[PDB]
């Protein structure tokens, strides 16, 4: 069977950064909209709109794009409010260094939860995939999912 959300986390404030040259900005927007919708119907509080529009960046510029986009989003919010989630679109082929850098920067420098999604899955946007990503986001932000065993 499928896991379900018992307790849904809250994603009030989120942003997206794209690192794939196969993905145009409006596709990143659509993907995030569909993901937000799936998180919501699965049981989360999830803002349908991001703090800032999605941006595309070169993998080489990972530290600069992350820090700049984080500062711009948190400055826009003010009030000591935090970014609850960064959605990252990754290229299909060797994301190794990029992925490691992303997680290091988000975990240890920015202190933000990130969820990475591969390009091929972004194009397909299958219900199964979106539901699976939603379950992952939920537990990362402090929600609770069922177990099957």
* CA gap 37, 45 in Å, rounded: 10
As a dihedral over the C-alpha atoms of residue 138, residue 139, residue 142, residue 143, rounded to 10 degrees, the angle is 60
DSSP characters over the chain: ----EEE--EE-SEEEEE--TT--HHHHHHHHHHHHHHHHHHT-EE-SS-SS--EE--GGGHHHHHHHHHHHHHHHH-TT----EEEEEE-SS--HHHHHHHHHHIIIII---EEEEEHHHHHH--HHHHHHHHHHHHHHTT-EE----
Domains and CATH numbers, the chain: 1-149 (3.40.50.2300)
* CA gap 141, 114 in Å, rounded: 10
Spatial CA neighbour of 3 closest among 143, 126, 132, 140: 132
Q: Which residues contact 73 (CB under 8 A, 6 or more apart)?
A: 13, 15, 51, 52, 83
Long-range Cβ contacts of 128-136 (<8 Å, 24+ apart): 130/34, 130/35, 130/38, 131/2, 131/38, 131/42, 133/35, 133/38, 134/5, 134/35, 134/38, 134/39, 134/42, 134/44, 135/3, 135/5, 135/42
Under 8 Å between Cβ of 114 and 85: yes
Q: Note the Cα 100 to chain centre separation in Å.
A: 16
Approach to solving: X-ray
Tokens of 12: 């009030």
Q: Give the residue before each break in the chain, using a C-to-N cut-off of over 2.5 angstroms; say none if it is continuous.
A: none
For residue 71, count other CB atoms closer than 10 A to its CB.
Answer: 11
* CA gap 28, 4 in Å, rounded: 26
């Amino acid at each position: 069977m499928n896991k379900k959300m018992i307790n849904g986390g809250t994603v009030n404030n989120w942003i997206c950064i794209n690192f794939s040259r196969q993905v145009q900005d409006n596709l990143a927007r659509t993907f995030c909209q569909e993901l937000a919708q799936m998180c919501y119907v699965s049981g989360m509080a999830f803002n349908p709109e991001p703090v800032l529009p999605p941006v595309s960046a070169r993998p080489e510029q990972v530290e600069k794009v992350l820090k700049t986009r984080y500062h711009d989003a948190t400055s826009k919010l003010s009030q000591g409010k935090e970014i609850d989630l960064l959605i990252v679109i990754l290229p299909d082929k060797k994301n190794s260094d990029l992925y490691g850098d992303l997680k290091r920067i988000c975990e240890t420098e920015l202190g933000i939860v990130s969820q990475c999604c591969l390009t091929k899955h972004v194009f397909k946007m299958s219900k199964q995939y979106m539901a699976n990503v939603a379950l992952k986001i939920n537990v990362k932000v402090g929600g609770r999912n069922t177990v099957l065993v």
